[PDB]
Point group: C2
Chain length 320, copies 2
């Protein structure tokens, strides 16, 4: 009860006109609407936020991972739900998480329409909590980005990340342990290391939806678990190879610190971390100049990162 | 020494291994509206052609207290049915047809065997509900979950025609209440169940109730009423539907009745299933608390006009439901909203 009064405003303020067991009509502009759905958790980044006593942006991470996966196929995020599971309910901690979820929903354009807080005393020790996220998007059936248009000669455009986002934090915590440094004390390019590590995942919803309306996008890859090696081939047709130009961008410094402090090898960095790339967009070469101009002028860090070539190689991604 | 995700890591491939094993069981739930996605970034499902103004009905849930007892007795083939049943039975309350379902599975180290049995129960619940299991997430957080503990959360999406949303405004003085029998406690009242089991020193596996061990009665999967309720709305003017969950008769029945209306329950119209008689005796529970904690054999209550009762009962009983007239609706002259006589 002490929580529902502190979070009834976030459900009210994120409300879309379509919102009426939560009720939400479909946006009127869709003639043949197709529902796109997904669920997620924040991951090991929860443990780092707990160790740091910083829960103010965990809810942004939760929404971002959901909504970024929806917009990959061209879907407009419609509504969001979360399942807050904990041992003993720390009202201040849950309020900070829900505030972050509300911020993520507002940036995504979707409404926080439902949720639940469950208390499992014997399963969570301390003040631990686990939050599941759930989001539903709508895409026009004819406008689904199914990746079937990815062809030889397409150019790859990368969108910069705000940091590690919400993947690879199991390795982050191991690197911090073996280095023994204090993340709040260790300064890194003028900011504490903890700020680099806890930075909320960037939400690409509005910029991608603006892009699809103006240029012809063939596919989009959200770089999450498994980094480049696992996520890029998910959008590649058979007999195609993605060639990444490693010189086209510099890693944000947090990834250099992680590599050095953990002695992490080249392939492992591109598997565990996004290394500064949140998303990769495949599109035909004549569309690149328009795409880069739109993205960089509308709040993104976009650059030409590579190309797609026809190839029967079993190594679907090359980072040279 | 070069640090890798194998020094700790969540083991994404174990989650990928789980999806590889249960891929066939999940495929069997696929509706015609389901479309293959790009690379699993999101699940694609079209809207059913039936709906001219579709309104999406969504909800999340967990089994919570029943999960504790299910793993304390080390039987987890039906808790996935409970997770789906709680979602989909709530959707049909407003008239929504369940469309698709997603689950969030979290544990310390992924036991692929235990997870596959839970997912198979979720898929089974989706088959009974007519919805598809179209996605999920498996999270490996070794430091947060100790022992063999796991947590599972469900998310469901249903569709309802906008002009047909059931909000209880059609409830009238004189509406007859039909009840749908439950399969047991379903998924509510289980902190009291665990307390009664403790204070009585009862091992529910070696305690026989009517020939079956008490654990079978306590852990019976929640009955799914989707297909019976959707047919009822199709063939009968349904005014309201009460889903008896947490809070029992006293809390859930008024939640669907409009203001200045009262439900009068005829207690002689049914006998409590024996699992509730056992819990009442072993816990010395007041009957008023029984109606507060447990559904006492009544999973759902439908309000509808008196002329349509015979057709409704014939339809429901033809689907295998345990249906009977449980009470009536009358104007509450600033009185209590639920009365059990």
């Amino acid at each position: 009860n002490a929580l529902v009064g502190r979070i009834k405003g976030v459900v009210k303020k994120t409300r879309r006109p379509e919102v009426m067991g939560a009720l939400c009509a479909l946006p009127q502009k869709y003639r043949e609407p197709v529902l796109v759905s997904g669920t997620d958790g924040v991951g090991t980044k929860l443990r780092l936020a707990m160790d740091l006593k910083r829960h103010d942006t965990i809810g942004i991470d939760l929404v971002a991972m959901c909504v970024n996966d929806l917009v990959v196929q061209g879907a407009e995020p419609l509504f969001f739900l979360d399942y807050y599971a904990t041992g003993k309910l720390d009202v201040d901690t849950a309020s900070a998480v829900i505030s972050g979820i509300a911020e993520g929903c507002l940036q995504s354009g979707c409404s926080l329409v439902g949720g639940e807080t469950a208390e499992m005393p014997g399963m969570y020790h301390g003040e631990d909590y686990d939050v599941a996220g759930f989001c539903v998007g709508v895409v026009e059936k004819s406008e689904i980005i199914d990746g079937s248009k990815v062809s030889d000669g397409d150019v790859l455009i990368a969108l910069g990340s705000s940091g590690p986002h919400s993947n690879g934090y199991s390795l982050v915590r191991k690197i911090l342990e073996v280095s023994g440094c204090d993340p709040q004390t260790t300064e890194l390019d003028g900011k504490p290391l903890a700020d680099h590590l806890l930075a909320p995942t960037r939400i690409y919803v509005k910029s991608v939806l603006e892009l699809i309306e103006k240029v012809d996008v063939h596919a989009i890859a959200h770089l999450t678990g498994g980094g480049f090696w696992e996520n890029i081939p998910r959008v590649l047709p058979d007999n195609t190879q993605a060639v990444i130009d490693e010189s086209s961008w510099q890693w944000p410094e947090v990834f250099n610190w992680l590599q050095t402090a953990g002695n992490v090898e080249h392939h492992e960095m591109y598997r565990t971390f996004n290394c500064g790339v949140g998303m990769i967009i495949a599109l035909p070469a004549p569309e690149v100049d328009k795409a880069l101009a739109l993205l960089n002028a509308n709040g993104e860090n976009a650059w030409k990162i590579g190309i797609i070539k026809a190839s029967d190689s079993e190594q679907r991604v090359v980072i040279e």
